[PDB]
Amino acid sequence: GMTEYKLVVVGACGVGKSALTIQLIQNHFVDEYDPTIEDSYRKQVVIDGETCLLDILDTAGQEEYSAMRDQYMRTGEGFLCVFAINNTKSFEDIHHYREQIKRVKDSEDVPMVLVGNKCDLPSRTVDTKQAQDLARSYGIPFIETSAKTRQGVDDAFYTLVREIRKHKE
Numbered sequence: 001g002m003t004e005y006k007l008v009v010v011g012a013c014g015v016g017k018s019a020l021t022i023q024l025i026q027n028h029f030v031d032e033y034d035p036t037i038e039d040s041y042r043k044q045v046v047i048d049g050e051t052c053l054l055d056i057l058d059t060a061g062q063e064e065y066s067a068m069r070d071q072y073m074r075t076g077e078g079f080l081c082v083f084a085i086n087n088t089k090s091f092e093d094i095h096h097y098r099e100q101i102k103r104v105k106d107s108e109d110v111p112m113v114l115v116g117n118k119c120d121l122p123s124r125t126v127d128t129k130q131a132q133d134l135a136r137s138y139g140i141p142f143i144e145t146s147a148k149t150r151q152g153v154d155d156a157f158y159t160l161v162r163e164i165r166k167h168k169e
């Protein structure tokens with residue numbers, strides 16, 4: 001049957017995990033999505049000529065037990081690690097998310113993509129070079145996005161699918 005890619009979107013509160021996912025799935029920018037809602041979304045896309053299904057968990061890191069979070073963490077194939085380019089703390093927190101991903105997968109070789117979001121905003125506090133150097137240290141792609149304008153949104157998710165394809169082969 002049709003190939004499915006199970007993706008998990010993670011990162012600190014307010015970096016735009018929900019806005020990015022909703023821009024990807026529904027092709028519009030949600031100004032204030034409830035910060036405590038976790039939910040999953042499915043969309044049929046074509047990536048490099050291949051029709052496939054994206055199965056995406058937009059995490060909200062609530063301490064209540066979430067069976068959806070449980071199933072996606074263990075069976076998820078790739079992770080988008082999101083920070084906002086005007087949120088220095090959320091860039092600094094990438095190390096924690098990368099560590100947690102390695103731990104939940106019990107694997108040093110997990111498909112991931114570093115995403116720097118909100119690039120429509122002026123006077124960023126996290127330089128492109130900063131994040132390019134970090135992703136290079138991790139050996140992962142870095143993509144700059146704007147969930148508001150849609151810049152780089154498809155690129156971020158499709159690049160993560162390509163990282164997963166490389167891992168599987």
Ligand SMILES: *CCC(=O)N1CCN(c2nc(NCCC(=O)N(C)C)nc3cc(-c4ccccc4F)c(Cl)cc23)CC1
Pocket residue numbers: 010011012013014035036059060061062073093096097100101104
């Ligand atoms: C603000 C609402 C929101 O979008 N989220 C809630 C908080 N959340 C989250 N927070 C943490 N905190 C750890 C603090 C830290 O950096 N220390 C060094 C102590 N940790 C999370 C971990 C995960 C996670 C668990 C397992 C595997 C992969 C993971 F990313 C998640 Cl999903 C969320 C948080 C972010 C979301």
Ligand SMILES: Nc1nc2c(ncn2[C@@H]2O[C@H](COP(=O)(O)OP(=O)(O)O)[C@@H](O)[C@H]2O)c(=O)[nH]1
Pocket residue numbers: 011012013014015016017018019020030031032033034035117118119120121145146147148149
């Ligand atoms: N200007 C701008 N605002 C954004 C962008 N992405 C998200 N936001 C806003 O940032 C705030 C937090 O976004 P949200 O998607 O709820 O973040 P989450 O906590 O990671 O799920 C919301 O007010 C969004 O409208 C963006 O790319 N550009």
Ligand SMILES: [Mg+2]
Pocket residue numbers: 017018019033034035036037059060
């Ligand atoms: Mg959210």
